[PDB]
Amino acid sequence: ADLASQCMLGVPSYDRPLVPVTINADHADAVFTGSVDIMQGNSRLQADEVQLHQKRTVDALGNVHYDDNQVILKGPKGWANLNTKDTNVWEGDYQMVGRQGRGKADLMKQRGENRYTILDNGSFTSCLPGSDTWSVVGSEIIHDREEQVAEIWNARFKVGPVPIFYSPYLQLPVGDKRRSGFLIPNAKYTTTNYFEFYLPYYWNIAPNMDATITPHYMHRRGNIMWENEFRYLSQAGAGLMELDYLPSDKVYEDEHPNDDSSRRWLFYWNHSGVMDQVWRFNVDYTKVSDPSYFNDFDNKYGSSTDGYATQKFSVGYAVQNFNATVSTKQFQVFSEQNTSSYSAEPQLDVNYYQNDVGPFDTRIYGQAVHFVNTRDDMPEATRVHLEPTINLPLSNNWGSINTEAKFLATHYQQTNLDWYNSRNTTKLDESVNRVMPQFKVDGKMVFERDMEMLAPGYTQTLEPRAQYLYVPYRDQSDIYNYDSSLLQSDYSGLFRDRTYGGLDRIASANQVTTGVTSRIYDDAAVERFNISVGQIYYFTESRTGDDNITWENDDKTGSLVWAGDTYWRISERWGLRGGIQYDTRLDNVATSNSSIEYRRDEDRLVQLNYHYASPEYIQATLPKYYSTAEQYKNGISQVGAVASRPIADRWSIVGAYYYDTNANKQADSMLGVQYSSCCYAIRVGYERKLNGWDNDKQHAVYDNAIGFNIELRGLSSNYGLGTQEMLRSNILPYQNTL
Amino acid sequence: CGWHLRDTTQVPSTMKVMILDSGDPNGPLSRAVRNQLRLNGVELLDKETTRKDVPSLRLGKVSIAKDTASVFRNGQTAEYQMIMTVNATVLIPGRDIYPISAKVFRSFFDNPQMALAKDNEQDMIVKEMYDRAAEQLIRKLPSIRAADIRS
Amino acid sequence: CGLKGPLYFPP
Amino acid sequence: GPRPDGWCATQASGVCVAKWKNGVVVPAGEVDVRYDGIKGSSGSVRDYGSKEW
Ligand SMILES: *C[C@@H](COC(=O)CCCCCCCCCCCCCCC)OC(=O)CCCCCCCCCCCCCCC
Ligand SMILES: *C(=O)CCCCCCCCCCCCCCC
């Protein structure tokens, strides 16, 4: 009894089988009368007065009912030719078979191979009979089943009996094939940027490319921003280009009156593909005119939110035992603080794998990179890395132990050190060589037990795991930190062999990692539950030479890191997740999160989640400005709730609410309602979100927003209630965690 | 203590010789899956082999999404929730096809002052997710063997 | 009125 | 025809959109990715359904 079934109830269906002139009359230029039935192919003609002329043509008079596998005709006068496959039916009505279109006319013609439906002074509507919500009555209408369109001449769009629109020419996409025309328009009011309006226009260039021009009129700025999109599908992959361009900004001229022009633009290019299974091309490029572009056209209040734009290219060549890649990675920082950043121009990655060298496995990894800074005072360097590896994996049914040896060799050539050295104590070096091995031992076991006491046919496992990592200590204070950052340690991250992501900081390690996992499988060998607990024991302090992390305790050795996980799959609808991260040097819980969700189907779902991040974790990792600002220093502690429920199978209510318990103030709040019908659909949305910080008053500012969509239905095979598109319409979008 | 050492291998005895079928055989996911099957002891076969009596694991679409998870007190995003979804089907020769899936969740704290360093950290997160999703696909093989027996 | 849809290679 | 049957001549956005049939390349997929919006200070894309035929 869903919307697809309700709108299909009034739709006629074809009963005869899908595959010749058999007449059937009571009284048989032969004239027939009473009640006739003419079957030629899949077509049928019904009337009470049909006569032949031969030479074979028929003339029907009175209560003519033409039937087909595509249309249905009714009228008081008819005429057809049994050789040209044409029918002329006078004033009456028609209705599509197997779909929703219908309307009336004065002269309806069927044409070549029953493909055209020529209409004179007719109308076309997509609603079910007895609704008459909207119609597109025009002078002439042409329906064709191949291109799936309805061309209308001298069209007058009507809502009810009111001709709200007039146009010389118009096309409606009656089907699923792509066609160029106007898409769904949007209306929106915001407490920051005021009234807005979008008018998309599609363009079907070719089967493998299309464009979309979207004039976006913002009232506050007094000009239209042209949002352009171009999608393509070539032999090298598929991508798209975005070019938004605002010729003049009246708000920007007030903030920055010294600039000659106030134009605003943004260019985004994204590409991703693989050609011939070897070549791998990737692009992710973003460029904007001014640093305040992302604040203005995101409904942001002030220039306080940090961020950057990523401008990456890549070309690769992958084989089963080798892959080489060249890539340049640049960024553009948009903070009020220092905006200097490094970029790799270019970077080369080479890998080579050769298995079965006896009982061992072999691997080689090389890299050659060049670092440049936007400023002309910061150092720049060239780095070359080599990393041969050797394994020895042994395994059986109940356990497996793997022993790995590795060697690390890096070379540096640093220049532009005059400014940095002249005002710092630890001088940098022109040439640095950093060679150091690595030895790791990993082990696992698995046990099983038949837990018939609790449930019949279930089984439970227990998988203890241990590891030992040893890396020697090399002083790295004379190497600038270009692309190394501290890594997070979830349960599976306890067994990682790196602390920093990059090659400029490689901390010494002398530690043993221990963990355990316990899974529960049901009688169908389907896993339902699993929980993991792990830790790291440091035998000696992990030193990276620099050693400039702001810890809370002066703890160096012992059990310092803990982590855990949980995933319970109660039923097909329920699902619970968890995770905690404890660090003794923080004397607190670093990070934690949880989530419980019920989801009967797409429309019906409830979800509760939690996110935590301690004040000490913000201090240890994020910059020194995040430990003193009132909008950063408290960490994260928020509770979220997402829900959805449809009523009467046409409505759909959606809500969301996120609440920061530290400040006792909300962070996000959403509420969307969409009424889906057989020939239209209306959506309304609301959202209150944080959009900046007021330094003068020391409290956050919010940004309200209420939208309004409208859409035509029945032309395409779409009957969704729009729940999944409303759930992702807020700054903290819904994510399926089932 | 009713425990005992596991006496059965993770890969069912009927899938000890399998055909790895993928549209991107040189990609990161196919390498991760092929690495897991080596550890368990599976003797992978070429697609163009003469054998028509061995199951085939066809690897499908892989999607990675990154979204905001929680925000600071000024609306700026604090952590990103990254999700990877992998689809695959196992074609038992003659019986049926059994679709399977794997979903991996990760978290990522951004730091605009270290933008080059966070891109290498983010590249490390995605590489590790291919290994987690490659393990979940292997753990769904014993359920396929038991479903095959029932049908 | 138009209909946005997926791309494909020409036949 | 150089490459054998089923060889994915072009893979786009995680799905194969062209494969060799017998000495010739034929389309075997579709791609539907659209511009999503600004993710802080950058662009993004969203997959509205890409499949293999
Ligand atoms: C087809 C799609 C989107 O199409 C649109 O509705 C967008 C507007 C179309 C026209 C744009 C104007 C530019 C055209 C240039 C050529 C003009 C030639 C003129 C020659 C003389 O349909 C949809 O998806 C949206 C549904 C349409 C809703 C229409 C309003 C419904 C409610 C009406 C209530 C009364 C309004 C009274 C208005 C006067
Ligand atoms: C749909 O996107 C536009 C209809 C076909 C475009 C070609 C003719 C341009 C003028 C059309 C008039 C706009 C009104 C469209 C129907 C509401």
Author numbering:
A (entry chain A): 25 to 43, 51 to 59, 66 to 92, 102 to 784
B (entry chain B): 19 to 169
C (entry chain C): 20A, 21 to 30
D (entry chain D): 23 to 75
From the paper:
The outer membrane (OM) of Gram-negative bacteria is a protective barrier generated by lipopolysaccharide (LPS), a complex glycolipid that makes up the outer leaflet of the OM. Following its synthesis and transport from the inner membrane, LPS is inserted into the OM by LptDE, an OM protein complex essential for most Gram-negative bacteria. Several copies of LptA link LptBCFG to LptDE in the OM, forming a protein bridge spanning the periplasmic space that functions as an ATP hydrolysis-driven conveyor belt for LPS molecules.
To investigate the SE mechanism, we also determined the cryo-EM structure of the complex of SfLptDE with the SE lipoprotein Rtp45 of phage Rtp, which is related to Oekolampad. This structure shows that Rtp45 binds to closed LptDE at the periplasmic OM interface and causes conformational changes in LptD extracellular loops (EL) 4 and 5 that would abolish RBP binding. The small lipoprotein (~6 kDa) is bound to the periplasmic, left-hand side of LptDE close to β-strands 5-8. PISA analysis shows that the LptD–Rtp45 interface has an area of almost 1,000 Å2 (CSS = 1.00). A β-sheet is present between Rtp45 residues 30 to 35 and LptD residues 318 to 323 at the base of strand β6. In addition, Rtp45 forms two hydrogen bonds with LptE on one side and two hydrogen bonds with LptM on the other, meaning it is sandwiched between both lipoproteins. Besides a disulfide bond between Cys30 and Cys38, Rtp45 has a long, partially β-stranded hairpin that protrudes upward through the LptD lumen. Thus, the conformational changes in LptD that block binding of the phage RBP result from physical displacement of extracellular loops by the SE protein, and not from long-range allostery as in FhuA.
